[PDB]
With several copies, the nearest count.
Chain A
Amino acid sequence: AGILFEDIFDVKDIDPEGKKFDRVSRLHCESESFKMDLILDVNIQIYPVDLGDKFRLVIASTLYEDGTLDDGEYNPTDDRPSRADQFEYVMYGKVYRIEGDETSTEAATRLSAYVSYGGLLMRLQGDANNLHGFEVDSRVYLLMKKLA
């Protein structure tokens, strides 16, 4: 279905150092059922978020849920393929590096993947089995919605 990662997160902190910018906040989130963590820059005038919130986070390579890669161009009239509309926050960025903790002999056991959403950054740390489908120079979507 083109999906790469899916989990439920829980906000821990909002601005550990201070309000640097006036329309963007730097969420610090911790995962459940996977024991990963997140660092996410999110616009806050449109999508307000505060402490103790839980949301569902999906990182998909395409919206058309059938494969059918994106073509990377903006067309507002194409409402046909019935994309993922069940979320409240959609973004579109690209992966710009992937780190690791491997030595000359063994393999990476805990990866770390970075993504840039047109200027808003994101990092995602976890064990190497979940950060599998990521690769540098690749477009991804970010999908979020709050839970009650």
Chain B
Amino acid sequence: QELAMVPRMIVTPQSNRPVMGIVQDTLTAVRKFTKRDVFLERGEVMNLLMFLSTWDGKVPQPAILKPRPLWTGKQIFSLIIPGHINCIRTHSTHPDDEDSGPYKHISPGDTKVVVENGELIMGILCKKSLGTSAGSLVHISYLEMGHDITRLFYSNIQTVINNWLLIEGHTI
């Protein structure tokens, strides 16, 4: 119990990086769930919040109060992120000529993930920011918060994203 339980073996001493990341089906949906234009109604937000195991019990104020209340993908994802962590990554389609000109902190393509004080401010999530690489979001959450909160992080991500994917659907 105190030596080899699976939440105690998230980062490996072989290459000092996590070994468990978000996987085959949840990754594709997490990328689409955090696009700039994903708005949810009231019933769907309630249905999604029903699946959070670490929810305090308050409903956040929508991003668009009028003409009618609509929540955003990043606004719901900001409830899954534990504690108050900080991180800066990039999305896999970041044009390298964006840090040169203006719009360095505006990013027309909605790149340059920024997680400030434990809430997603901007950016799309992908394997560079949620998978098993050094400096990822799961790595930082393990380094700062501990080994018993990253477990809840994984579980909440999976359940919430699956129960939205059966509304959004996916195929080939």
Contacts and interface: CB of A to CB of B under 8 A. Distances in A.
Q: A–B direct touch, CB within 8 Å, in complex? A: yes
Interface of A: 17, 20-24, 26, 39, 41, 43, 46-47, 70, 72-74, 76, 87-93, 96-97, 114, 116-121, 123, 137
Interface residues of B, number: 34
Interface string B114-155: 101100111000000000000000000000000000000000
Contacts of B23: none
Contacts of B64: 43, 46, 89-91
Nearest to B67: A46
Contacts of A120: 36, 63, 72
B61 interface: yes
Contact of A116 (B60, B69, B122): B122
Contacts of B110: 20-21, 119
Contacts of A92: 61-63, 65
B105 interface: yes
A91 B63 contact: yes
Nearest to B74: A119
Nearest to A136: B116
A96 B73 contact: no
B63 A21 contact: no
Contact of B35 (A21, A88, A116, A117): A21
Contact of B66 (A17, A24, A87, A118): A87
B51 interface: no
A39 B106 contact: yes
Nearest to A71: B61
A119 B106 contact: no
Interface in B59-93: 59-75
B61 A116 contact: no
B62 A74 contact: yes
A142 to B, nearest CB: 10
Given A21-B36, A24-B37, A96-B114, 7 more contacts: A46-B67, A74-B59, A74-B60, A74-B61, A117-B63, A119-B72, A120-B63
B7 interface: no
B67 A72 contact: no
B122 A123 contact: no
28 contacts: A20-B36, A21-B35, A21-B110, A26-B108, A43-B39, A72-B60, A74-B69, A87-B66, A89-B67, A90-B65, A90-B66, A91-B63, A92-B61, A92-B62, A92-B65, A96-B121, A114-B105, A116-B121, A117-B63, A118-B63, A118-B71, A118-B72, A119-B63, A119-B74, A119-B110, A119-B120, A120-B72, A121-B107
B97 to A, nearest CB: 13
Contacts of A20: 36, 108-110
Interface string B30-67: 00000111010000000000000000001111111111
Contacts of B65: 90-92
Contacts of A119: 36, 63, 72-75, 110, 120, 122
A23 B37 contact: yes
